[PDB]
Coordinates of C-alpha atoms and ligand atoms in Angstrom, one line a residue:
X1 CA 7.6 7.3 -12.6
X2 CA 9.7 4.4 -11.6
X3 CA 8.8 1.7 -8.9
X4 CA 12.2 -0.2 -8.4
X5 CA 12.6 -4.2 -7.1
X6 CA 8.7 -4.6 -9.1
X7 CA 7.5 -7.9 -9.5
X8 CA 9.0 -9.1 -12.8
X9 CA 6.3 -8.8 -14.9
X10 CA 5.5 -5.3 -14.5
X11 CA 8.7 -4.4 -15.2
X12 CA 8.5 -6.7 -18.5
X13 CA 5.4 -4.0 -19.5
X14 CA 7.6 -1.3 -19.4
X15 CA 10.8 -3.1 -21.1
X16 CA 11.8 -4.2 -24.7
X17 CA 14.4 -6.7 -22.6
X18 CA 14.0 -9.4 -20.5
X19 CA 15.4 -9.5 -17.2
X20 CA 15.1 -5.7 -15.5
X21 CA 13.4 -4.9 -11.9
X22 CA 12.2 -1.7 -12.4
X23 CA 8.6 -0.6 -13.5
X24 CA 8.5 2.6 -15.5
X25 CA 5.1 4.5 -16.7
X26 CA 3.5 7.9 -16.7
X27 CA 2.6 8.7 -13.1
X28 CA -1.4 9.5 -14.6
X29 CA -1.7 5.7 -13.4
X30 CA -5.0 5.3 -15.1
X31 CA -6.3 7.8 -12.9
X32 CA -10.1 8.3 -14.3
X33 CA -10.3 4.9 -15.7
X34 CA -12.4 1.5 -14.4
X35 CA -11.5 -1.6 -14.7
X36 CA -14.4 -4.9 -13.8
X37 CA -12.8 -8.0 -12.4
X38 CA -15.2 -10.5 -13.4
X39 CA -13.9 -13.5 -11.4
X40 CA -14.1 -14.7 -7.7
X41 CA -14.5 -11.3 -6.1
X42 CA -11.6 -8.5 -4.6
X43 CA -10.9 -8.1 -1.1
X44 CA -11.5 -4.1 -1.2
X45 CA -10.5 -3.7 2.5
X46 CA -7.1 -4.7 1.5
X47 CA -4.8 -1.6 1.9
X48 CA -3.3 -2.3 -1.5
X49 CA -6.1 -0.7 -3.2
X50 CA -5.9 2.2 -1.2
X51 CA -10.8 2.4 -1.2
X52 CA -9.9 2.4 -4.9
X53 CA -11.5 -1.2 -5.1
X54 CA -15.4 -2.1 -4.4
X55 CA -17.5 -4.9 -4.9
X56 CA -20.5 -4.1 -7.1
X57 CA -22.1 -7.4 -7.8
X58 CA -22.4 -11.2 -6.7
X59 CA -24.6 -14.2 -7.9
X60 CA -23.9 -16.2 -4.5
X61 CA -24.5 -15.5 -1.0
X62 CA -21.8 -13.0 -0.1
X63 CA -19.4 -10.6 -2.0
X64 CA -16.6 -11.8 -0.3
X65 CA -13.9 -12.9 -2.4
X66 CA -13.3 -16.2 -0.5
X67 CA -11.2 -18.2 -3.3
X68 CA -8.5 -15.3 -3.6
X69 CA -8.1 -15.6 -7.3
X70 CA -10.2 -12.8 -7.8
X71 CA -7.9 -10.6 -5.3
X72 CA -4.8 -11.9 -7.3
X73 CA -6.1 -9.7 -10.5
X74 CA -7.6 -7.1 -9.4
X75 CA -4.2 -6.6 -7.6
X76 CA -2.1 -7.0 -10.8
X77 CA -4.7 -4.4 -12.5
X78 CA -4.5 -1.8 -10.0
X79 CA -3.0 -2.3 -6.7
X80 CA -0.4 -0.1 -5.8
X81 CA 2.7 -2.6 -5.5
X82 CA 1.3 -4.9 -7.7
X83 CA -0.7 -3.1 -10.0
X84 CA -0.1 -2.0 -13.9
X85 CA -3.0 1.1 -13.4
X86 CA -2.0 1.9 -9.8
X87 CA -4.9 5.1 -9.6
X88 CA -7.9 3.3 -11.6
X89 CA -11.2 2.4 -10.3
X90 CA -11.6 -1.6 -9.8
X91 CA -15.0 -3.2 -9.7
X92 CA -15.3 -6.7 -8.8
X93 CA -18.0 -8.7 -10.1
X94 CA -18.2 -12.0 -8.6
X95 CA -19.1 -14.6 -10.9
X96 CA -17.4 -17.6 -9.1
X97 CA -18.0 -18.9 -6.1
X98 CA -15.4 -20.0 -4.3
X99 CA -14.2 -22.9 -5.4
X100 CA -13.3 -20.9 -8.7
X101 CA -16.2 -22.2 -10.8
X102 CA -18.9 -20.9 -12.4
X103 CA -22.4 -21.9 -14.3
X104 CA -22.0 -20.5 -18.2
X105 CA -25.7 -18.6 -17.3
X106 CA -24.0 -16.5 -14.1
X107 CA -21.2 -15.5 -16.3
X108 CA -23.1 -14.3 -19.0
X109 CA -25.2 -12.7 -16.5
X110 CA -22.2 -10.4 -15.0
X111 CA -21.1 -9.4 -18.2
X112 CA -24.3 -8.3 -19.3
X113 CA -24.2 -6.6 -16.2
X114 CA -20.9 -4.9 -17.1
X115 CA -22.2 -3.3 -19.8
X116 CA -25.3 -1.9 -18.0
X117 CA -23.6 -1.1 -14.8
X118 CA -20.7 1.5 -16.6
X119 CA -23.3 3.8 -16.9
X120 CA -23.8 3.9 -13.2
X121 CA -19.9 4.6 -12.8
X122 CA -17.7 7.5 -13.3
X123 CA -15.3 6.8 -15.6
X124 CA -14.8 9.5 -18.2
X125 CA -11.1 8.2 -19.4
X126 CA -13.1 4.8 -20.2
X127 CA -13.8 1.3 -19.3
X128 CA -12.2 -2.3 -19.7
X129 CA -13.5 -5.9 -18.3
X130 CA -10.5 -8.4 -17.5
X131 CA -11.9 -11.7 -17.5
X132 CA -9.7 -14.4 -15.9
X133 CA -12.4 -17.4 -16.4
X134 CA -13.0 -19.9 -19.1
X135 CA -14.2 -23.3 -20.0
X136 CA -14.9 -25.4 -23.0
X137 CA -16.3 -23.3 -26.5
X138 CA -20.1 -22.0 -25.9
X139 CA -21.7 -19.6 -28.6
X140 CA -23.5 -18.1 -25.5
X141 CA -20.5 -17.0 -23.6
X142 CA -19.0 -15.9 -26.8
X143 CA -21.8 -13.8 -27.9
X144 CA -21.9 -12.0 -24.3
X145 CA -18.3 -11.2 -24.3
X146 CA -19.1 -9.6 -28.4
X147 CA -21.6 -7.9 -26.4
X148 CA -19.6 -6.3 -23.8
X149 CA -17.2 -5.1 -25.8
X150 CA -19.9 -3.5 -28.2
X151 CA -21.2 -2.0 -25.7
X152 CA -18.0 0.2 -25.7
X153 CA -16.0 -1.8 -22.9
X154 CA -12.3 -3.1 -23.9
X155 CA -12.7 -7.1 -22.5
X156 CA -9.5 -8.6 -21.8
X157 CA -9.6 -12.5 -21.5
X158 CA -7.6 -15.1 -20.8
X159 CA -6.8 -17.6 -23.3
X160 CA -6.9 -20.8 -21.2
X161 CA -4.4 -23.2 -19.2
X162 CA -5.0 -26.3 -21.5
X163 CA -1.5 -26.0 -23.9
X164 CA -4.5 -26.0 -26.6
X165 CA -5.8 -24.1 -29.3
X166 CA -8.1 -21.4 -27.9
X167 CA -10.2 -21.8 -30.4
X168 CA -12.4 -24.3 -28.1
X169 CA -12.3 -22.4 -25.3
X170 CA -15.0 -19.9 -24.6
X171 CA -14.8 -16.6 -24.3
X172 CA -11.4 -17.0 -25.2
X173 CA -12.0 -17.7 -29.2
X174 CA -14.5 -14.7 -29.3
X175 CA -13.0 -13.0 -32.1
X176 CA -13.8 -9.2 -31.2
X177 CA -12.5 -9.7 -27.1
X178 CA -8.2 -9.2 -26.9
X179 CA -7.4 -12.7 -25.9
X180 CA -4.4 -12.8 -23.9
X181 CA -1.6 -15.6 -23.8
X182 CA 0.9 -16.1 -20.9
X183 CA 4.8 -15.8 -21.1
X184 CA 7.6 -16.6 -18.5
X185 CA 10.3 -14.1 -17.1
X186 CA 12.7 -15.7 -20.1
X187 CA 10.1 -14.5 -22.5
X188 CA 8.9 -18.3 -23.4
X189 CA 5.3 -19.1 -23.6
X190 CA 4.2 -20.2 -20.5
X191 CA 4.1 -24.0 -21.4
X192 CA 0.3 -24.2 -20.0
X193 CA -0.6 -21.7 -22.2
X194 CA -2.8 -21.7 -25.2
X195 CA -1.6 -20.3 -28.3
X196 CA -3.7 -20.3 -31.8
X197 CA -4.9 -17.4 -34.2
X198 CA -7.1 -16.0 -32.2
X199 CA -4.3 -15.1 -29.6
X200 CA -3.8 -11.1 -29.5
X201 CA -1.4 -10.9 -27.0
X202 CA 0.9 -12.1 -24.7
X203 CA 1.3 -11.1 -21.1
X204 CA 3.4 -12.1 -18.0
X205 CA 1.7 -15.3 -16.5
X206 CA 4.2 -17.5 -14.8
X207 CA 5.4 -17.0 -11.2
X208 CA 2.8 -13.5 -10.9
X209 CA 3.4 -11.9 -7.4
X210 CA 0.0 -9.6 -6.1
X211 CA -2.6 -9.7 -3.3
X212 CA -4.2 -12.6 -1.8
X213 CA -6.8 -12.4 0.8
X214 CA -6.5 -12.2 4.4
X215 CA -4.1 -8.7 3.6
X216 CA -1.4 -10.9 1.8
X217 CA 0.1 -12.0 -1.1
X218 CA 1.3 -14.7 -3.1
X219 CA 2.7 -16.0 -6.0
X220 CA 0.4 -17.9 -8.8
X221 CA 0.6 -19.0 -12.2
X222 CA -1.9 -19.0 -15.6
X223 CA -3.2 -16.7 -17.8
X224 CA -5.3 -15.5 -15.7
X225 CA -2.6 -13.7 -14.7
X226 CA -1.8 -12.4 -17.9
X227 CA -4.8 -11.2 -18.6
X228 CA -5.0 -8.2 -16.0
X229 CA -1.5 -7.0 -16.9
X230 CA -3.5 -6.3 -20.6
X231 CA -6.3 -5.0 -19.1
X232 CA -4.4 -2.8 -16.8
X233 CA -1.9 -1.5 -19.5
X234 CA -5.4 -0.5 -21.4
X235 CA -6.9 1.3 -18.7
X236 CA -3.4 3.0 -18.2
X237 CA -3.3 4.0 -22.0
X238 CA -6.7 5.1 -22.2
X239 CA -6.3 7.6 -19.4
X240 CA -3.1 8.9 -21.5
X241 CA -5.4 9.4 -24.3
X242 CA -3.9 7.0 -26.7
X243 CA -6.4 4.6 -27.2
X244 CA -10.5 4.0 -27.2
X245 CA -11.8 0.7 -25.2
X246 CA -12.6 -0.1 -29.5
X247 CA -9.3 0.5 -30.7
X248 CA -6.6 -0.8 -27.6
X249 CA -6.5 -4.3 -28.8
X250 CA -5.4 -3.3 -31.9
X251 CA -3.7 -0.4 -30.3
X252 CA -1.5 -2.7 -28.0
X253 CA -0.7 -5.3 -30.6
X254 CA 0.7 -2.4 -32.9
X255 CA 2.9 -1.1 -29.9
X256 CA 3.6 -4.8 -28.8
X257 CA 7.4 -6.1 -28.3
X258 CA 7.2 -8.0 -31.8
X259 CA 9.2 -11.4 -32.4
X260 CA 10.7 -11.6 -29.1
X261 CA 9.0 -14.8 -27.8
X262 CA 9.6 -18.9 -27.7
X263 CA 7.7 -21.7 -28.0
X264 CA 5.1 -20.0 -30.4
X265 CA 3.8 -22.6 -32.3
X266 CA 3.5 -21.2 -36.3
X267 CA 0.3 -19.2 -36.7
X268 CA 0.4 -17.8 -33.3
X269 CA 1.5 -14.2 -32.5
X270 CA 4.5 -13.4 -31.2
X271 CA 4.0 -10.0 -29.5
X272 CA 4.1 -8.8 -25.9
X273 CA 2.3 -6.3 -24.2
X274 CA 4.6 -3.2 -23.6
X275 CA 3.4 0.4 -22.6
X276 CA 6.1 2.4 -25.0
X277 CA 6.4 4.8 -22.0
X278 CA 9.8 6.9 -22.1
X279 CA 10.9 8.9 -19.4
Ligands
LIG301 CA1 -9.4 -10.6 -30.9

């Protein structure tokens, strides 16, 4: 398949070049994978997701995603514009209210709920957790995130928007979680982004179009945009059979564009996500 004018950083997935337009992958989509966006909420109603999205838990008076950061990932996950996996399954999980922050306790709680609640779902290709949240280093949050992916769930998170090592940040320097660093459309690191050893991956997360609420969309910038493009590209490889939600960490850093990045600083990675797919 091929989705021309795409937002630039799907088209970066599907590219070993900077600079195309056009989004290329294996029309399977991620058909009969999920995906849990732990963050603000998702809008389902919005026709992007084509009843492909729900809302399966909230810690705060509604399920509404009333922030719209939430929205933003699940839409560069799965929506069908905007989306990496344009057929998964999306789950929000609203650990943030909406302002956009979060007590440590509720966060661990929707994780843990994560890796209860895939048992409850369908999703026979498997399951991956894209986490666009983070604050300062907590062995708690870390060990919920180890959790999560024991439990067999491939958790994508975001390194953090401090130009810092993400080895303070939590659950960003969780070793056994893919923790995802943001580039720019001139494959630089995205100058908020942090870098450090625990870094897996870089994905797109400066100037992100995808869904907002209200049916719209927008713009934004962060790695927590860059986190659903990894998390989506897993889903999408695990319904093509090429990966486990154990193995596509190390799966997508072996298939990574290698050594194309700036502003690395020595000791961080330099790979970018990239879905191999040839027409
Ligand atoms: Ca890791």
């Amino acid at each position: 398949a091929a989705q021309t004018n795409a937002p630039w950083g799907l088209a970066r997935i599907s590219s070993t070049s900077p600079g195309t337009s056009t989004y290329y992958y294996d029309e399977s989509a991620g058909q009969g994978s999920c995906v849990y966006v732990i963050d603000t909420g998702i809008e389902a109603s919005h026709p992007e997701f084509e009843g492909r999205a729900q809302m399966v838990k909230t810690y705060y008076y509604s399920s509404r995603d009333g922030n719209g950061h939430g929205t933003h990932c699940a839409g560069t996950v799965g929506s069908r514009t905007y989306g990496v996996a344009k057929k998964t399954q999306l789950f929000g999980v609203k650990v943030l209210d909406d302002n956009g922050s979060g007590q440590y306790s509720t966060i661990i709680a929707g994780m843990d709920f994560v890796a209860s609640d895939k048992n409850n779902r369908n999703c026979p290709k498997g399951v991956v957790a894209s986490l666009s949240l983070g604050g300062g280093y907590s062995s708690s949050v870390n060990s919920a995130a180890a959790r999560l992916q024991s439990s067999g769930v491939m958790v994508a998170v975001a390194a953090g928007n401090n130009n810092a090592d993400a080895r303070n940040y939590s659950p960003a320097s969780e070793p056994s979680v893919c923790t995802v660093g943001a580039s720019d459309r001139y494959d630089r690191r995205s100058s908020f982004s942090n870098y450090g050893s625990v870094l897996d991956i870089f994905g797109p997360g400066t100037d992100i179009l995808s869904t907002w609420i209200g049916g719209s969309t927008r713009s934004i910038s962060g790695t927590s945009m860059a986190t659903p493009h990894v998390a989506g590209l897993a889903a999408y490889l695990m319904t093509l059979g090429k990966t486990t939600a154990a193995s596509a960490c190390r799966y997508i850093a072996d298939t990574a564009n290698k050594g194309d990045l700036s502003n690395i600083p020595f000791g961080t990675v330099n790979l970018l996500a990239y879905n191999n797919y040839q027409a």
